[PDB]
Amino acid sequence: HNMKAFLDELKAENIKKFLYNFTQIPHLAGTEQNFQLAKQIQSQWKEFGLDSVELAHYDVLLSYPNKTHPNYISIINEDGNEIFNTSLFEPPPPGYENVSDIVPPFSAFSPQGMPEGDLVYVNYARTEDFFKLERDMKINCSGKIVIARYGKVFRGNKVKNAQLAGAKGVILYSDPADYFAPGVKSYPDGWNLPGGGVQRGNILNLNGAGDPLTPGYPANEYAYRRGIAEAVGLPSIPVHPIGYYDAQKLLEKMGGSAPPDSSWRGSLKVPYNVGPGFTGNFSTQKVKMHIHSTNEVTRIYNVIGTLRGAVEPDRYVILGGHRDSWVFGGIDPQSGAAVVHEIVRSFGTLKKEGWRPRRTILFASWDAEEFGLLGSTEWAEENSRLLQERGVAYINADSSIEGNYTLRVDCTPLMYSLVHNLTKELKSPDEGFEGKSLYESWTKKSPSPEFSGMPRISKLGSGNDFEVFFQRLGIASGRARYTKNWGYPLYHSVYETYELVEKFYDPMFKYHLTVAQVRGGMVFELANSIVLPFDCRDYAVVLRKYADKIYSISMKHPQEMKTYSVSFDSLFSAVKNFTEIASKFSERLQDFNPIVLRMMNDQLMFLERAFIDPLGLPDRPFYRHVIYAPSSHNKYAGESFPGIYDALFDIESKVDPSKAWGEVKRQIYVAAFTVQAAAETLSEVA
Amino acid sequence: HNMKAFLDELKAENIKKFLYNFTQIPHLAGTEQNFQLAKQIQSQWKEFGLDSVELAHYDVLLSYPNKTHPNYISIINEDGNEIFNTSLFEPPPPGYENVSDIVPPFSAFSPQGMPEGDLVYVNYARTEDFFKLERDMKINCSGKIVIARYGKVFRGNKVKNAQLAGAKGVILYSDPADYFAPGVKSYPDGWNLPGGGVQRGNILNLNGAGDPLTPGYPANEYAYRRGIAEAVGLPSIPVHPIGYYDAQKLLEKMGGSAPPDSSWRGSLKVPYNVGPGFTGNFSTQKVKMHIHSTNEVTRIYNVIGTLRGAVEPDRYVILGGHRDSWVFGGIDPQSGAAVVHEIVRSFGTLKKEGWRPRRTILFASWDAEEFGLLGSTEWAEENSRLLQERGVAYINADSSIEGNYTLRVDCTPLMYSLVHNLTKELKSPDEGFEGKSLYESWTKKSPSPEFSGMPRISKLGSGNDFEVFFQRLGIASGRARYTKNWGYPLYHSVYETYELVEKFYDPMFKYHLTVAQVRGGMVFELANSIVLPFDCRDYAVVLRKYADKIYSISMKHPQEMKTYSVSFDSLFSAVKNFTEIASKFSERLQDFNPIVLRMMNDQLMFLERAFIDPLGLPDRPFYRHVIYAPSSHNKYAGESFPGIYDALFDIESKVDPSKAWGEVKRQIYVAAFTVQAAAETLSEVA
Ligand SMILES: *[C@@H]1O[C@H](CO)[C@@H](O[C@@H]2O[C@H](CO)[C@@H](O[C@@H]3O[C@H](CO)[C@@H](O)[C@H](O[C@@H]4O[C@H](CO)[C@@H](O)[C@H](O)[C@@H]4O)[C@@H]3O)[C@H](O)[C@H]2NC(C)=O)[C@H](O)[C@H]1NC(C)=O
Ligand SMILES: *[C@@H]1O[C@H](CO)[C@@H](O[C@@H]2O[C@H](CO)[C@@H](O[C@@H]3O[C@H](CO)[C@@H](O)[C@H](O[C@@H]4O[C@H](CO)[C@@H](O)[C@H](O)[C@@H]4O)[C@@H]3O)[C@H](O)[C@H]2NC(C)=O)[C@H](O)[C@H]1NC(C)=O
Ligand SMILES: *[C@@H]1O[C@H](CO)[C@@H](O[C@@H]2O[C@H](CO)[C@@H](O)[C@H](O)[C@H]2NC(C)=O)[C@H](O)[C@H]1NC(C)=O
Ligand SMILES: *[C@@H]1O[C@H](CO)[C@@H](O[C@@H]2O[C@H](CO)[C@@H](O)[C@H](O)[C@H]2NC(C)=O)[C@H](O)[C@H]1NC(C)=O
Ligand SMILES: *[C@@H]1O[C@H](CO)[C@@H](O[C@@H]2O[C@H](CO)[C@@H](O)[C@H](O)[C@H]2NC(C)=O)[C@H](O)[C@H]1NC(C)=O
Ligand SMILES: *[C@@H]1O[C@H](CO)[C@@H](O[C@@H]2O[C@H](CO)[C@@H](O)[C@H](O)[C@H]2NC(C)=O)[C@H](O)[C@H]1NC(C)=O
Ligand SMILES: O=C(CC[C@@H](Cc1ccc(C(=O)O)cc1)C(=O)O)NO
Ligand SMILES: O=C(CC[C@@H](Cc1ccc(C(=O)O)cc1)C(=O)O)NO
Ligand SMILES: *[C@@H]1O[C@H](CO)[C@@H](O)[C@H](O)[C@H]1NC(C)=O
Ligand SMILES: *[C@@H]1O[C@H](CO)[C@@H](O)[C@H](O)[C@H]1NC(C)=O
Ligand SMILES: *[C@@H]1O[C@H](CO)[C@@H](O)[C@H](O)[C@H]1NC(C)=O
Ligand SMILES: *[C@@H]1O[C@H](CO)[C@@H](O)[C@H](O)[C@H]1NC(C)=O
Ligand SMILES: *[C@@H]1O[C@H](CO)[C@@H](O)[C@H](O)[C@H]1NC(C)=O
Ligand SMILES: *[C@@H]1O[C@H](CO)[C@@H](O)[C@H](O)[C@H]1NC(C)=O
Ligand SMILES: *[C@@H]1O[C@H](CO)[C@@H](O)[C@H](O)[C@H]1NC(C)=O
């Protein structure tokens, strides 16, 4: 009973069976169907052999369209007539036109409203897009409806950016330039987005809070909830998404200024005029939104399975991914959840033969991830003390594939070595690499920008269920999935089905199987290796990289750094110290008795934990990791030394430079202190 | 080598020698003399046999009078003449009239100013005193100088209360009714306060922040400091203390309303008129303060000694007390520090013979405790990650005696059993109890208000160096000292000398020796017992007591609890659960292998830690313990369920009752959740 045994028990055919089983009806959070799937998963995980399997439920704020009062957008003429209306549903996929309860496209958590106004086209609605509109083009968004294309950044950042600019409404759409791959056919004949396809998705700005009504505390039966008016993260203007057929109708009459350059033009046969408003003929027509969605406190259910550790049952390695989907979830998330199900099945087969892992493994099927990571965050708020004193690692398990080209890993530097070592022992599934390792194919296809002969591994960002574990609690975290050659066209649409995956992404299920071996093999090592498989020297390498980068951003303002005596010396000193201490620690780790071992492993487990500042980042108390936080411009992207980065952002625009530069210095001191403090956790303990 | 060996090595004669050595010159924080004593202590602890002994220094905000521009108060006539002036120094004690650098009486951190006005007498300046003045007597303090007597509550709460009432100055004084014991002579002929004696002391309201300029982070060499304007906890009006000779001069001319009752009258031959202002003859005279003290960032030094553990070197038991004193520190703190020095000496004797404790013991000599607990708090901010993952217990060691009657212990319920068991094995030093245990004499003299045949043990409050460890970090903490039959007259005066202790408090040093056996024996057990000597069942008992108490406070408002559906059921359910789970845990602890042991001990060590809410209490982010916080009316006193207590305080005065009662419910939910969460840390781990 070893890792090879675990890995050999995983079967592509089983992943395929489970994916099919998980994707025949929609499993939207808060619905009957998703409770039923949770019950099924709990039953099967027990049958698979876990020691215990429980549902953990919470009553959280969710959001749904009004069934009898649909959401839509109009062009209205001056007479008041609605002369063009967007579509009320996506044409359902072949063979699914009778499935009940497909939720129509909507932006979850939109407030209600029927605003009317002139359209302004804001490109991707990124921070830089609004800067370009307002500062360079002198175009004023206040009181206008903005239309923005999806992509580049999390949609919630788009809405926040629109709000701050004074917009009274947001219309989101998928441009073929971003969601239609050239040379491939639309679903059902290929994997491309049809013009009637629409990306659903929440538009919250929770900054890691979880349920908007109970930030800090689990939404259990006796919770005291904020009123809607004080809820965290809800947008203050109506928002609705549409497909590119409808978008074309809204964009074609656009007047005002031309697009500032070609980076602002998508693929529709439309000028991409920024506005405000329409051209001459139609300058009297307007855009009207009709949004009637309601926010509703609704029960959600996590499935939590436990495989007790033989030696350190009080040390937890967690494999977690969500189960709730927008409609059928053929990729998002069931391609990940089917992989988790087969991982549980394999571990349980070993267990039934008398094996147990050294440490406890917890398996999680999270609910309401699509509505703001609510299920993972509420459970972690409930269990925060257990997690912070016992949590070894968290491996996420959302969609296993978003392409069929190569591997994509985003993790803490603590697991870089683990990931290199594991992938060297796994067979590549790729054409042209038969008989060669996954490591070889991945490094060949996705080389490191810095080191020859190594693969790219990215920082963790946010916007998935690892966020509370890593960014709030400081538990070492990672994720891995197959990706494209550098999202995917049918993301969050009704066309993400079992057939999309089985026909176009992974017909042999070999990419699913490889991802199962990576996620499963990581959890196996973390739960069974005698010494935890973390290399602190890898952190010392990246900290230097990030310190160089942040210093180079500051050095765009040399005169201000002289005037205000802005020095990075403390941060560099801390990083140098971390490097030296980590080096000594690594020598002792190889050169040593279970208390020494357990004292040692605790140093490795609490090293990620040491980067947490209990005071949080400014105005973001649930983002506490001083090295990594979600980017303030794009929740999906990771930022390093985010406190310093945000202090320096757009600093030349601040009215009181002394105060702005003071706050940069304050952030340098906080970062330097935290790096040194983390380093000292690796010093000899007495 | 066992506890008896440790205890027998402690000698009364050595405590006496060290006390004498520590009290011949003043050791005010930030001065040359106190750095020299720190160096001496470090040298001796090394000689005593500790493994390492370091100074940990920080640059913190301190406050000192201006040497060439003394602080004083006047009665000024309408002509502008200063017709009476308070004294510029206390008459120094016999044989010490040539000692240099005795700091004159002042209120540390007072701002500068020379306000003039009418006096109002505010009794003890407690919350209830100001309520009585303003609501019942209709006396308006705005723009008036208040005169208040020391006692009952921390002086800082007095100043905060005066500020909030609109006072422009505060004069603090020691009334004989509170600081002169009947039938005993004044120093040097007895232990009573002479009329020229004055209590020094800081008047900050830091709420656990430590150095006013660097809340959250150590005041190290690269720290970025707040400006004085944003500093935490500084008073906004001038404050100065005086003795009762001077107080009599200021109080004798007082007019306006009579004292509302006899609880408002002290012992001076004065009417205790509340004012405002003086009687007819002198109604045109005024009181003028002259305060010229300056706040100065100043280096302070902690001495940190380590005795490495043989088995769990990564588990810390800390014995810490301060070294800085107002003048000679004959009781405060050197009676405690001399005890610590002899404890270190005894442990080092065992070490020199080849013994080591099971866990690491850390010994601390803290600086600048008198200026706001700055040395212990900065070191704990520096080492917070080590402390929270490794800190087993903190035993404080300030003044060993404040009387010669009986023992006084204030601790976490987790150490109640430890304290009972230890004191049953110690000989009582008391007259009439020769041959009988310390337990027997203490319970006889200070019985429990609740259980026959047990002694009183009180909650921890704050205002001493355990505050950061217990209230911020959640490390189990305790303190013990000999006390009077229910502060002490010469507290913080120049008369607290070696002679006061050797002549009047403890001439045989037997009370010092007994306190050394208690503090030392507690640290020995905590550092050496195989299973940590904490009983979680004791916590379950007090939690029920506190839940009953807080419910009984709320039930003063039955109509409001019906209207707003204010239920305590969740809190009672949590406490019941904690009781049941603790009971099972205790059974397993007696019924079990070093990992099981270490997994078990970790449950005991992290149990205090589980009562910490990382979000802090409302507007008090550094007070994080949900069960215990310093009282918002008296930093010295402990409050239980302080979040709920403060929500209910004076609630019938709140203008929006729906909102006030909502916040009571929110606090009940937070408390219930935290109790249940702490209970679940004692559940089986998987
Ligand atoms: C990386 O690791 C280093 C440990 O090897 C550590 O070095 C410490 O650095 C601090 C400076 O930040 C040193 O502080 C000095 O301590 C001595 C006493 O040991 C003091 O005398 C000295 O006094 C001052 O001199 C100042 C500087 O010129 C002056 O401004 C002051 O007013 C005062 O006169 C300093 O406070 C400490 O000793 C060092 N330990 C060593 C060298 O072994 C680094 O700080 C660490 N990096 C970080 C970010 O922590
Ligand atoms: C002390 O320890 C107890 C464990 O023995 C624990 O008991 C749990 O209590 C909660 C109630 O707070 C129970 O919650 C219910 O869970 C079931 C499913 O297991 C739900 O069906 C049920 O649904 C609801 O019924 C509600 C109440 O009438 C209603 O308002 C809702 O809308 C919904 O229909 C409840 O959510 C849980 O099962 C209990 N575990 C048990 C009994 O074993 C205590 O909560 C704990 N005390 C604290 C403060 O944690
Ligand atoms: C997915 O697979 C499960 C497990 O086999 C199916 O659930 C079972 O359905 C059978 C036949 O109705 C019942 O006898 C069992 O009680 C079910 N087992 C459970 C819930 O654990 C489930 O119906 C399948 N779903 C689809 C769409 O094929
Ligand atoms: C990844 O594999 C490398 C090569 O096997 C491991 O590094 C070796 O670890 C052993 C065990 O301590 C050492 O004795 C060798 O000297 C190491 N070889 C090196 C550094 O080249 C590495 O530990 C593995 N990473 C893990 C387990 O996280
Ligand atoms: C307190 O005791 C210490 C320790 O004996 C005395 O310090 C020593 O003084 C002698 C005589 O001057 C020196 O030779 C040593 O170098 C000192 N030892 C140290 C500093 O560790 C100290 O002087 C005593 N103080 C008083 C007031 O009696
Ligand atoms: C205090 O002393 C009592 C009496 O010795 C200790 O309680 C006993 O502990 C032993 C060891 O587990 C048990 O076998 C006995 O049943 C206990 N006696 C009781 C409960 O009456 C108690 O453990 C000690 N407290 C400590 C060490 O914190
Ligand atoms: O939908 C999500 C969050 C974002 C997805 C990543 C993602 C983010 C954006 C796109 C897109 O714009 O097409 C596609 C995928 C993840 O982290 O798995 N979770 O279910
Ligand atoms: O002076 C102090 C803080 C308060 C003291 C307790 C104390 C508190 C008040 C008095 C008094 O009013 O006479 C006396 C003693 C302690 O906690 O040791 N620390 O050095
Ligand atoms: C949906 O449709 C209409 C909107 O006014 C109304 O009858 C019904 O209350 C709505 N449902 C909600 C708000 O859940
Ligand atoms: C848009 O829908 C509204 C409401 O149902 C209707 O009055 C109008 O005729 C529609 N416009 C078009 C072009 O269908
Ligand atoms: C832009 O928007 C509206 C135009 O109606 C105007 O009232 C507002 O004050 C303008 N503000 C800025 C900052 O340009
Ligand atoms: C699957 O891989 C092939 C081979 O390169 C590629 O052409 C095709 O685009 C891939 N399918 C998807 C959905 O990426
Ligand atoms: C103390 O005395 C006077 C007050 O104005 C002045 O000469 C000197 O600056 C003062 N010292 C300080 C502020 O430290
Ligand atoms: C009080 O002191 C001031 C300043 O030194 C002086 O002018 C005045 O004479 C003094 N008053 C008395 C009564 O000594
Ligand atoms: C009380 O104080 C002063 C008296 O000069 C007055 O100006 C102030 O407004 C009064 N306020 C209250 C609340 O009684």
Ligand SMILES: *[C@@H]1O[C@H](CO)[C@@H](O)[C@H](O)[C@H]1NC(C)=O
């Ligand atoms: C010391 O104890 C005696 C004996 O009861 C008592 O009368 C005296 O007041 C005590 N001294 C002090 C300072 O308490």
Ligand SMILES: [Ca+2]
């Ligand atoms: Ca919550």
Ligand SMILES: [Ca+2]
């Ligand atoms: Ca500080």
Ligand SMILES: [Cl-]
């Ligand atoms: Cl993932």
Ligand SMILES: [Cl-]
């Ligand atoms: Cl004490």
Ligand SMILES: [Zn+2]
């Ligand atoms: Zn997903």
Ligand SMILES: [Zn+2]
């Ligand atoms: Zn998704």
Ligand SMILES: [Zn+2]
């Ligand atoms: Zn003291």
Ligand SMILES: [Zn+2]
């Ligand atoms: Zn004191």
